[PDB]
Coordinates of C-alpha atoms and ligand atoms in Angstrom, one line a residue:
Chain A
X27 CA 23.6 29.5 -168.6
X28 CA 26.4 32.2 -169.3
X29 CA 27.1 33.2 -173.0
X30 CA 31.1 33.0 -172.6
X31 CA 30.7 29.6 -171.3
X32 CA 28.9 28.1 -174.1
X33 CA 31.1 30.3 -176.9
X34 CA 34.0 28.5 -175.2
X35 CA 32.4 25.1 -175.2
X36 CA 32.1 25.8 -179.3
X37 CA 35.8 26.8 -179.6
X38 CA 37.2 23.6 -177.8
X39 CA 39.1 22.2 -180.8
X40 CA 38.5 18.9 -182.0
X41 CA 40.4 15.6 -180.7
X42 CA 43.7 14.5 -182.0
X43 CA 45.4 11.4 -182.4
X44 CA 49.0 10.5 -181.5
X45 CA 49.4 8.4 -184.3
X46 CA 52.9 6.4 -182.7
X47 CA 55.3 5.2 -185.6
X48 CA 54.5 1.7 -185.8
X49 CA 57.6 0.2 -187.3
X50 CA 59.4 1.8 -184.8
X51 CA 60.4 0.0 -181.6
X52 CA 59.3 1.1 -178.4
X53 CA 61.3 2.9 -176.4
X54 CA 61.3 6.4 -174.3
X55 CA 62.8 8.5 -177.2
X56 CA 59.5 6.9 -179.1
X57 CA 57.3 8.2 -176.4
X58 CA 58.9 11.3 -176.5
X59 CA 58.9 11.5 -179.8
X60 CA 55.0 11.0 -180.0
X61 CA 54.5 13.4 -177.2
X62 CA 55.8 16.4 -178.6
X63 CA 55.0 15.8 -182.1
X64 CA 51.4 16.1 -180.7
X65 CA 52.0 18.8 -178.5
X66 CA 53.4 20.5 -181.4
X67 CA 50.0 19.9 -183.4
X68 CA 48.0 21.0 -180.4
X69 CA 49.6 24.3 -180.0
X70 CA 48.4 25.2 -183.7
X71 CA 45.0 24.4 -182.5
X72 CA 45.5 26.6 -179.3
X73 CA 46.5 29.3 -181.1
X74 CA 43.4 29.7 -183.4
X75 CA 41.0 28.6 -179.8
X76 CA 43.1 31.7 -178.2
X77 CA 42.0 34.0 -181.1
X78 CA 38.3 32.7 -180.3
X79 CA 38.2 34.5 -176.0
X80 CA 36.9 37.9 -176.1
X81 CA 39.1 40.2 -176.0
X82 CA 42.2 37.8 -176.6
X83 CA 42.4 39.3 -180.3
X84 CA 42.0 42.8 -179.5
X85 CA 45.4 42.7 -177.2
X86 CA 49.0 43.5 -179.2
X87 CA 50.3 40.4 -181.1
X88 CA 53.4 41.0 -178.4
X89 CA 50.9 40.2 -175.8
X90 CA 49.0 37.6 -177.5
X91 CA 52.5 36.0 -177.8
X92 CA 53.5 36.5 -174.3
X93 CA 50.1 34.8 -172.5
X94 CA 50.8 32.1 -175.1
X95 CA 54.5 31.4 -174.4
X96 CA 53.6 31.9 -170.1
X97 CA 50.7 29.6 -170.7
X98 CA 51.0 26.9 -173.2
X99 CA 51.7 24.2 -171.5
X100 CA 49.1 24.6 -168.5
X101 CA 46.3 24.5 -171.6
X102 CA 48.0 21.3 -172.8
X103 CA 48.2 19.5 -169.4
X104 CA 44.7 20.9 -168.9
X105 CA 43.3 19.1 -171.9
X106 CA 45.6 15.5 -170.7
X107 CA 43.5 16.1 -167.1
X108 CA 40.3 16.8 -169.0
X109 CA 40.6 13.6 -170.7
X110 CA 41.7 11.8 -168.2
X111 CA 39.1 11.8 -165.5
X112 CA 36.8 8.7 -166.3
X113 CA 40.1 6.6 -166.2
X114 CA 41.9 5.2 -163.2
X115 CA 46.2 5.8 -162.7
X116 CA 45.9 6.7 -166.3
X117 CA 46.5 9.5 -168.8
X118 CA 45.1 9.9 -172.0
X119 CA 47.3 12.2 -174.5
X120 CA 45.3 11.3 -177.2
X121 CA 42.4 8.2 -177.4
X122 CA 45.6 6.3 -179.2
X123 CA 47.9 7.2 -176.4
X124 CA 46.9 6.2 -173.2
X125 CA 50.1 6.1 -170.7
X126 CA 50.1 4.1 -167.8
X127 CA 52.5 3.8 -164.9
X128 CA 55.1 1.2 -166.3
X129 CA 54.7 3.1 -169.3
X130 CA 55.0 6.6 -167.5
X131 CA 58.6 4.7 -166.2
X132 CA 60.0 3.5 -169.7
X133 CA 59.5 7.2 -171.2
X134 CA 61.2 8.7 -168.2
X135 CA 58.1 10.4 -167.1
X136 CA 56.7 9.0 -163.6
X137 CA 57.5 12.1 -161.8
X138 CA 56.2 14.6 -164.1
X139 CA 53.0 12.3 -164.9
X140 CA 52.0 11.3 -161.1
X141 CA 51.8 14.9 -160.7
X142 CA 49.2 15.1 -163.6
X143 CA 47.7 12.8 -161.9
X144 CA 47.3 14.6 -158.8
X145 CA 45.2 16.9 -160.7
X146 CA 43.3 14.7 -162.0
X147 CA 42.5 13.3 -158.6
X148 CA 41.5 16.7 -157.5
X149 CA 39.3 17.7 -160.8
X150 CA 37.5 14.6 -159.9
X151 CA 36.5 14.6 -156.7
X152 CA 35.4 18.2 -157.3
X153 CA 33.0 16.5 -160.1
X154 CA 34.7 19.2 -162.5
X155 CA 32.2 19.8 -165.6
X156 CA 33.5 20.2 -169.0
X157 CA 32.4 23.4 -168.5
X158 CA 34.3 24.5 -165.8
X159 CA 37.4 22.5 -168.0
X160 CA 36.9 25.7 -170.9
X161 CA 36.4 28.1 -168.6
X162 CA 39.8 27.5 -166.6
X163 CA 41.7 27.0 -169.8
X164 CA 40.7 30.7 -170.3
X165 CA 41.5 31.9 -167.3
X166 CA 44.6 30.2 -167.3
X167 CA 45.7 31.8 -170.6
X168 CA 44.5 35.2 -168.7
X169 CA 46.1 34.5 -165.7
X170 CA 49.8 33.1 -166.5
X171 CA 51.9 35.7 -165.3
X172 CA 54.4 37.0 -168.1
X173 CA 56.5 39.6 -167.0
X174 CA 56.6 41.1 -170.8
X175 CA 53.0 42.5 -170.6
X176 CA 52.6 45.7 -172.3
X177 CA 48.6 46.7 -171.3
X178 CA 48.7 45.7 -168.0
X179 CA 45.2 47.0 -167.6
X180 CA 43.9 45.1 -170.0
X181 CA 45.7 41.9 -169.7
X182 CA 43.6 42.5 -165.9
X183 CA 40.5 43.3 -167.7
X184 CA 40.3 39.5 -169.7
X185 CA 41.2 38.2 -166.4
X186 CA 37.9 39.8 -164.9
X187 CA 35.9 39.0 -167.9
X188 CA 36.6 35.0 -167.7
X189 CA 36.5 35.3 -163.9
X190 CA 32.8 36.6 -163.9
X191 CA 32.0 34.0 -166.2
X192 CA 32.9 31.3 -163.9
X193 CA 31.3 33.1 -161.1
X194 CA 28.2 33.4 -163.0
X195 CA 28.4 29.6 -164.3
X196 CA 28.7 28.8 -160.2
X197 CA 26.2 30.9 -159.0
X198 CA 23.6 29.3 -161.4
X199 CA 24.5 25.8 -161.6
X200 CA 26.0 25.2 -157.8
X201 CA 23.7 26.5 -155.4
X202 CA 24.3 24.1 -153.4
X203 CA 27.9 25.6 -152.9
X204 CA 28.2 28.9 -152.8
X205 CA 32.6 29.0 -152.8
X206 CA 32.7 26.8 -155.8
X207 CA 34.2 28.9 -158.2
X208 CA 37.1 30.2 -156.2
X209 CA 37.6 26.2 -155.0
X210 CA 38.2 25.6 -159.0
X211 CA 40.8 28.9 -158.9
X212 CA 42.5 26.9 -155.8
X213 CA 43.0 24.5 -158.1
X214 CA 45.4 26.6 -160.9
X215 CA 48.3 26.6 -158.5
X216 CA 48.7 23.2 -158.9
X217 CA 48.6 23.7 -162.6
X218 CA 51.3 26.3 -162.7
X219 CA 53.6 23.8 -160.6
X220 CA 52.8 20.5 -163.0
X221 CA 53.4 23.0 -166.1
X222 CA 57.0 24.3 -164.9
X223 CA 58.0 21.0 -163.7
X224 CA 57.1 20.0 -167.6
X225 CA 58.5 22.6 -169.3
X226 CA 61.6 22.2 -167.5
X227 CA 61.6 18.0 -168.3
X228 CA 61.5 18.5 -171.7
X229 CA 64.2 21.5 -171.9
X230 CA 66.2 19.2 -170.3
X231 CA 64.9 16.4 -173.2
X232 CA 65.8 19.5 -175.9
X233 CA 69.6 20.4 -174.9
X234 CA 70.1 16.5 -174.6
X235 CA 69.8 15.9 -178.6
X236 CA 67.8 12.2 -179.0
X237 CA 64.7 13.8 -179.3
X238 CA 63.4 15.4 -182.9
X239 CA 61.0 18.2 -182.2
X240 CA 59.3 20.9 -184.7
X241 CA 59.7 24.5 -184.9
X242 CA 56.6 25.6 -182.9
X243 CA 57.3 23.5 -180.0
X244 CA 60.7 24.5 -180.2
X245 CA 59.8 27.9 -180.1
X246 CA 57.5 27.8 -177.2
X247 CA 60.2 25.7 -175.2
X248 CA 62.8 28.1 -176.1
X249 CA 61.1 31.4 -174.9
X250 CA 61.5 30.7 -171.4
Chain B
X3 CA 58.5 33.6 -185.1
X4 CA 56.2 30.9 -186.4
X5 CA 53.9 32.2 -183.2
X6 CA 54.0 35.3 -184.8
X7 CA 53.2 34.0 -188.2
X8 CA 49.9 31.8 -186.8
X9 CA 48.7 34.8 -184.7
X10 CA 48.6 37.2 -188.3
X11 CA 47.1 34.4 -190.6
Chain C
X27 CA 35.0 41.9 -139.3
X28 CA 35.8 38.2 -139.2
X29 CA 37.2 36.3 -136.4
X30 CA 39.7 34.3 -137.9
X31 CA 40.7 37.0 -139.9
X32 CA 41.0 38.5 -136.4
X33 CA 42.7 35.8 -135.0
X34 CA 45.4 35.5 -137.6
X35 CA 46.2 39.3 -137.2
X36 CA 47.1 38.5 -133.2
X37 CA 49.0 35.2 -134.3
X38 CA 51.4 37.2 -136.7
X39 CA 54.5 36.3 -135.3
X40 CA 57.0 39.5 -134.1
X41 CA 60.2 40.9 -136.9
X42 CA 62.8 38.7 -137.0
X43 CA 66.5 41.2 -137.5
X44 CA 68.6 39.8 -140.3
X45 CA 71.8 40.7 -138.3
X46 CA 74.4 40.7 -141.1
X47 CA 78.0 40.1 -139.8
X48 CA 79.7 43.3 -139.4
X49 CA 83.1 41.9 -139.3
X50 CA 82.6 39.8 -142.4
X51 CA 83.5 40.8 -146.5
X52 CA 80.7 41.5 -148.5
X53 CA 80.7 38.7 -150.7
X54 CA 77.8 36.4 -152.6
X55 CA 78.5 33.5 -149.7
X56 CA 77.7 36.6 -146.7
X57 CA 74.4 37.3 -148.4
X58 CA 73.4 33.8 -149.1
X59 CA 74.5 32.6 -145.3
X60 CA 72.5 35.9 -144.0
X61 CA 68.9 34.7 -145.8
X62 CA 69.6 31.1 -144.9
X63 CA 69.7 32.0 -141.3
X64 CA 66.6 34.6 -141.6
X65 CA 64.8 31.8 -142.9
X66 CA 66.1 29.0 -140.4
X67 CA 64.9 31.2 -137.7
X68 CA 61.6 32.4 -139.3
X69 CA 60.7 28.8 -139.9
X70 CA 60.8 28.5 -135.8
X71 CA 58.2 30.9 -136.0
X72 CA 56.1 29.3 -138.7
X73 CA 55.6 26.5 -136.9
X74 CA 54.4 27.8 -133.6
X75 CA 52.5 30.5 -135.8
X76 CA 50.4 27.4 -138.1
X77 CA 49.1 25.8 -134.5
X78 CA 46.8 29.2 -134.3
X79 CA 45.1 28.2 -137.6
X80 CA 41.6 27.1 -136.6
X81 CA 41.7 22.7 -137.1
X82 CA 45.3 23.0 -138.4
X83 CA 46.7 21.0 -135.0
X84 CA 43.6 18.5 -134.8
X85 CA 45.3 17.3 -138.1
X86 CA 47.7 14.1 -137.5
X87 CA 51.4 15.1 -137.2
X88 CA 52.2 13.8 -140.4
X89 CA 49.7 15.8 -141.9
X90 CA 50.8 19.3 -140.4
X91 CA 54.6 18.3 -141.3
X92 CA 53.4 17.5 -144.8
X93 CA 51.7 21.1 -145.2
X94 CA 54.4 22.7 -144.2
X95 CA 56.9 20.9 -146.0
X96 CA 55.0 21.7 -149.3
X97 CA 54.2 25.3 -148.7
X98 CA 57.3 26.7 -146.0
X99 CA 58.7 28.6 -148.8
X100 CA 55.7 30.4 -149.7
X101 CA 55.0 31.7 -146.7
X102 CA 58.8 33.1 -146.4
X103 CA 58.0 34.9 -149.9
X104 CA 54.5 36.3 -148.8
X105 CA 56.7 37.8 -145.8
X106 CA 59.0 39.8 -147.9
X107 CA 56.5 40.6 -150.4
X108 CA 53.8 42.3 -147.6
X109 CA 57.5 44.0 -146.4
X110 CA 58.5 45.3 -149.3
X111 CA 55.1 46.9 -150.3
X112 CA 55.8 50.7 -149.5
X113 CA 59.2 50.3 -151.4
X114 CA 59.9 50.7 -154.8
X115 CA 62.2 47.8 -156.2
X116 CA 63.5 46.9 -153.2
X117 CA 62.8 43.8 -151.2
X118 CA 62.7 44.3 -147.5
X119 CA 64.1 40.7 -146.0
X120 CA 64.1 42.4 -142.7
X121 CA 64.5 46.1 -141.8
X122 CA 68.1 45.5 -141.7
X123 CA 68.5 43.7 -144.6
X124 CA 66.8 45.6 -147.7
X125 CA 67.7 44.3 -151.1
X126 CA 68.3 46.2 -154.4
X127 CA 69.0 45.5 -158.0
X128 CA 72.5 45.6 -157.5
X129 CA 72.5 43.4 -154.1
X130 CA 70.7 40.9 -155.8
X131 CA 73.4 40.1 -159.3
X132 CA 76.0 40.3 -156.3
X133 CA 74.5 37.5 -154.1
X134 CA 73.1 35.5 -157.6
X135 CA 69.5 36.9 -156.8
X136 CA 68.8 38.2 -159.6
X137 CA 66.1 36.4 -161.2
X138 CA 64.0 35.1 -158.2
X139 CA 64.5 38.3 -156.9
X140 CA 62.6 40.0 -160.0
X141 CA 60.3 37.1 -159.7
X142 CA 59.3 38.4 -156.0
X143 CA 59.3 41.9 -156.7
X144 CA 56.4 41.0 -159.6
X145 CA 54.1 39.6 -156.5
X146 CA 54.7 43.0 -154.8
X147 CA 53.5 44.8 -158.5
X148 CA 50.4 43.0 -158.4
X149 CA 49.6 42.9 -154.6
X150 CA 50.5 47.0 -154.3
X151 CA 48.2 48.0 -158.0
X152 CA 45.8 45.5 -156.1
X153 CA 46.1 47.5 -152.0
X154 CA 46.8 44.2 -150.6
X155 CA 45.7 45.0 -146.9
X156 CA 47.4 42.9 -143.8
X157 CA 44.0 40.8 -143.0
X158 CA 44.5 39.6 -146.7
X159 CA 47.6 39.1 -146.3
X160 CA 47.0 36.9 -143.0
X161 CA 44.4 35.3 -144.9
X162 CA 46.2 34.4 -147.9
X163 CA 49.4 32.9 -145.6
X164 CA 47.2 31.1 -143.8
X165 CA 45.4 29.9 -147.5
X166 CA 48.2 29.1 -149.1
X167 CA 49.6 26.3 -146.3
X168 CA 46.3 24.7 -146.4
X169 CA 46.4 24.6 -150.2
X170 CA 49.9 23.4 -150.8
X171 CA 49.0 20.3 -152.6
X172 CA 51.5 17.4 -150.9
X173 CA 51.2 14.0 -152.7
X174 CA 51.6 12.6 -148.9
X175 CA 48.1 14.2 -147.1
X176 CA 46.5 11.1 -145.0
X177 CA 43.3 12.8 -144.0
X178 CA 42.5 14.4 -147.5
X179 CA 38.9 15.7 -146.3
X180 CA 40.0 17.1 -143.0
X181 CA 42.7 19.4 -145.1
X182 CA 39.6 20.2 -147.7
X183 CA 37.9 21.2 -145.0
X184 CA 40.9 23.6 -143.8
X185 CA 41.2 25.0 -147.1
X186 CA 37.3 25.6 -146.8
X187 CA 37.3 27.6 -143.7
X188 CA 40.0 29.7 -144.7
X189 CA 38.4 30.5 -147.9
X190 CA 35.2 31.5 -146.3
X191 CA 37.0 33.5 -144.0
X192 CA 38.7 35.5 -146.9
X193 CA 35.0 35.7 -149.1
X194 CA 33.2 36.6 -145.9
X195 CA 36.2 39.3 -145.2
X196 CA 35.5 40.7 -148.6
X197 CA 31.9 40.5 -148.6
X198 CA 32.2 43.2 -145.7
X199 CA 35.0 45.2 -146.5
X200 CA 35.1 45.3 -150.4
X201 CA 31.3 45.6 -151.2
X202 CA 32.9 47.6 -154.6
X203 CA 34.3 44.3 -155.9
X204 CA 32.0 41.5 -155.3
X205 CA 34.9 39.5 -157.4
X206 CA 37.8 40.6 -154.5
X207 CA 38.5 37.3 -153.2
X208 CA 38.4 35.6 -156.3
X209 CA 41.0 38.2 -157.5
X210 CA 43.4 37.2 -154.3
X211 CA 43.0 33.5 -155.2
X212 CA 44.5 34.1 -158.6
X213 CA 47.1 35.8 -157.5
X214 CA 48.3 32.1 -155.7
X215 CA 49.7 30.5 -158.9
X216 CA 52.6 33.0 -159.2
X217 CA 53.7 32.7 -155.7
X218 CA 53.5 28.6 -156.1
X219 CA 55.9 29.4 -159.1
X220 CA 58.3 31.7 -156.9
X221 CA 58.4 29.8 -154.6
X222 CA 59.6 26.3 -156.6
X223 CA 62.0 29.1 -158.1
X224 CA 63.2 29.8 -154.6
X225 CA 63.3 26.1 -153.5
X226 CA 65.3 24.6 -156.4
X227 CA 67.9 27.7 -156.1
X228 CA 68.7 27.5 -152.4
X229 CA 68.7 23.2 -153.4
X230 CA 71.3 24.1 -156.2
X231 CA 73.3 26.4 -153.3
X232 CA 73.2 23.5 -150.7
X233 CA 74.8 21.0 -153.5
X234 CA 77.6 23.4 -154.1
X235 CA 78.5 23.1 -150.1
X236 CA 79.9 26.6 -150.3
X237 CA 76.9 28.1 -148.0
X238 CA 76.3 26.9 -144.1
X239 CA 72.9 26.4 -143.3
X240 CA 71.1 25.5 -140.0
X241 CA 69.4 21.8 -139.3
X242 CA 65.7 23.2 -139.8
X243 CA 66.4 25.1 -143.0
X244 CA 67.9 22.2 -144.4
X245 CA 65.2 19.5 -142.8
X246 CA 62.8 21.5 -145.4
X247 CA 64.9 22.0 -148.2
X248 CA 66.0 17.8 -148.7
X249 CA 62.0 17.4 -148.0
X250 CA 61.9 17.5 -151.9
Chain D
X3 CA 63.4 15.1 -137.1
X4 CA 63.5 18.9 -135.6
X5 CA 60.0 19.6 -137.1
X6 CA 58.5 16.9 -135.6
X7 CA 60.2 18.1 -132.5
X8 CA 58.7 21.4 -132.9
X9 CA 55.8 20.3 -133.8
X10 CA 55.5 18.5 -130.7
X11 CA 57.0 20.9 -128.2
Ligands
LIG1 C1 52.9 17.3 -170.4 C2 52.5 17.2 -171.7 C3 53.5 17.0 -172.7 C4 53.0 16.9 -174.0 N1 53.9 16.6 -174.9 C5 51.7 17.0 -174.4 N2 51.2 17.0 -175.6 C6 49.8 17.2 -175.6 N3 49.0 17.3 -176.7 S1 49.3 17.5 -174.1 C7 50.8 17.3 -173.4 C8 51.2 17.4 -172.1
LIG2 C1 63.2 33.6 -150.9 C2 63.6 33.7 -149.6 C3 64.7 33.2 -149.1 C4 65.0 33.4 -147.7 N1 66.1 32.9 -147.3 C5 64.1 34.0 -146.9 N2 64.3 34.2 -145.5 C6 63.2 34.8 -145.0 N3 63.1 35.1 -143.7 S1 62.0 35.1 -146.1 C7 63.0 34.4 -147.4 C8 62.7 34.3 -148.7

């Protein structure tokens, strides 16, 4: 099939593990604590994957920075949905760190992860291929609406690049259903809604103090 | 900006 | 062109005047109490205008109160944006009720208002047309992801129609840009994130009790 | 519930 397809199918960064403390007890500033050290891992790895998209590198480092601090935490999510859709009611963070609903409860998180797993319940009724998964990360990044963009133009022009790379990966594989690739763009409002509802959980988790977190997640958390 | 720093190295 | 696209243009419901109280202060608490009861009375509207949407009242009750509950603010927001799209940093509530920068830090408006005025940017560097505009209202009720839908594959097939109404609609009228549609999908995620914006702030208004507001405003607002 | 109601109506 399509060439950015398969050059994003070789940039999808390699699994990590969670790796929960344990000698410590369990508790939700434990979960939380696991959770964003590996979020804080994973954006390191997002970073270099970003560098990876054509054209992503060619953009100012100002607006590198600004699709990465509008977008972070729709890519992350992405990747929790991603690994999630073999399994039933639960989420896989990491192949060490699978939350499920009592679990989502004792971390404080059943709100924020039942509407994970509303995409999830989408992605997999629409059968979504791994793919389509690299694909809408990119477009995602792309797509994520910073109001900081200096080249507008061609912020829009990476946007139609990854765009007609789904389109093309549709209109070769899914004959059978010509409106497939804007079904999977229906499905990034959903994202944008699960991703504010998370950035805005673990603010909230930030200015209350319990929880350590490092300087990169920190810094993404912060620029909004 | 540690973001910063990653997107130079 | 298109029939439903037609048929939605015929269904737009009439302008709706603001009617600001002449004999009351300009303050924050006139402005907020203005929009509260442009929206109360626009939401009347709504409802009588979703019936026209082809299968949208062949849905259960509980179904078409759950679409609207989840997407009622968007289509509020698309109506000021298509408004305000021959105006230049101004958002035009109604034609008696036009907002500026300066209206907006005195009634608190600031940042959703900015938030709105970046969906007019990208629909006026895009020429958003009315029948898109229709289109995308219409799109964006059947696509407003409630965690309460009973007949899940009756409201896929909703979303369905709609989007092959707008893909057919550009197919005709947009033969230039055989990505068009696609392009007025994306554009979905930021009004989903204005629209949360606009929801939680008007929530944070009615817990301060300083701002009346009508029965049906408020019946949608304590939805979430 | 006033939706409901106009729902109906
Ligand atoms: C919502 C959410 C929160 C995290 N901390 C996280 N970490 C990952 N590696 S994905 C993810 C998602
Ligand atoms: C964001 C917003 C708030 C309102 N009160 C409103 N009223 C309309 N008729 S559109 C709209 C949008």
């Amino acid at each position: 099939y399509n060439k950015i397809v398969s050059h994003l199918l070789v940039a999808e960064p390699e699994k990590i593990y969670a790796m929960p403390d344990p000698t410590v007890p369990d508790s939700d500033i434990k979960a939380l604590t696991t959770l964003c050290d590996l979020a804080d891992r994973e954006l390191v790895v997002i970073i270099g994957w970003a560098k990876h998209i054509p054209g992503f590198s060619t953009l100012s480092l100002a607006d590198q920075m600004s699709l990465l601090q509008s977008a972070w935490m729709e890519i992350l999510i992405l990747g929790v949905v991603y690994r999630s859709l073999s399994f039933e009611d639960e989420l896989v963070y990491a192949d060490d760190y699978i939350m499920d609903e009592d679990q989502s409860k004792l971390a404080g998180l059943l709100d924020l992860n039942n509407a994970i797993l509303q995409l999830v319940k989408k992605y997999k009724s629409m059968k979504l291929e791994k793919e389509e998964f690299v694909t809408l990360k990119a477009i995602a990044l792309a797509n994520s609406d910073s109001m900081h963009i200096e080249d507008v133009e061609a912020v829009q022009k990476l946007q139609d690049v990854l765009h007609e790379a789904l389109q093309d990966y549709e209109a070769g594989q899914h004959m059978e259903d010509p409106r497939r690739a804007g079904k999977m763009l229906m499905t990034l409002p959903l994202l944008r809604q699960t991703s504010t509802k998370a950035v805005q959980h673990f603010y909230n988790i930030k200015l209350e103090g319990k929880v350590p977190m490092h300087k990169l997640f920190l810094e993404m958390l912060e620029a909004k | 900006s540690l973001l910063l720093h990653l997107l130079k190295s």
